[PDB]
């Protein structure tokens, strides 16, 4: 939740949907424990790890493109130092506050 906040960098604040340093508005969050928790894990929701660089406030990226973790030339071909950034989620009824 704190990664949706101004002035921080991470796998979400810069690589999912950037938000500016000058928030105007509100932060609202319904309790998703009884709405968005399912047995076996909510692996439908997916997050990446990095992108090319920082985004701009409220930009859309539905593409799941493979980013270059290292500096080898993928040359349009996935492989060494060209890894999948997306990962799944495990949500369980025994999960803690964190």
């Amino acid at each position: 939740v704190r990664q949706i906040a101004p002035g921080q960098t991470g796998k979400i604040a810069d690589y999912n949907y950037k938000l500016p340093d000058d928030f105007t508005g509100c932060v609202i969050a319904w309790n998703s424990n009884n709405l968005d928790s399912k047995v076996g894990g909510n692996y439908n929701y997916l997050y990446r790890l990095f992108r090319k660089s920082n985004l701009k406030p409220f930009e859309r990226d539905i593409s799941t493109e493979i980013y270059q973790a290292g500096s080898t030339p993928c040359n349009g071909v996935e492989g060494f130092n060209c890894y999948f950034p997306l990962q799944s989620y495990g949500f369980q009824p025994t999960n803690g506050v964190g």
Partner: nanobody, 116 residues
């Protein structure tokens, strides 16, 4: 009628099967057309997805079980089922825009599937 489904039927445990869905025009497939299943009892889940950027990334839990391909001659869409057990009763609908929540999905009639 602008979208149809073809293939499927009884699944002998350990046998192969064929399934399909169709569309109307090339602009209808633009930009996203993702496979999806449903199931009585078992939660609904999306089968396969083909993103318009050229890279296809199936769900990490469902990327090693289903092969997905597209044929635009009939607008058909090959789907295969392999080794269903008694715990996987699924009913298949061809519903688009599931990565948009329950505000962009299109509901029609579909077909009813029972797996014993």
């Amino acid at each position: 009628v602008q979208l149809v489904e073809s293939g499927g039927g009884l699944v002998q445990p350990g046998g192969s099967l064929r399934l399909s869905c169709a569309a109307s025009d090339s602009s209808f497939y633009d930009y996203e057309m993702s496979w999806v299943r449903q199931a009585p009892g078992k939660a609904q889940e999306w089968i396969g997805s083909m993103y318009p950027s050229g890279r296809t990334y199936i769900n990490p839990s469902l990327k090693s079980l289903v092969t997905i391909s597209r044929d635009n001659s009939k607008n058909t869409l090959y789907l295969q089922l392999n080794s269903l057990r008694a715990e996987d009763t699924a009913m298949y609908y061809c519903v688009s825009n599931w990565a948009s929540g329950s505000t962009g999905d299109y509901w029609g009639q579909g077909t009813l599937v029972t797996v014993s």
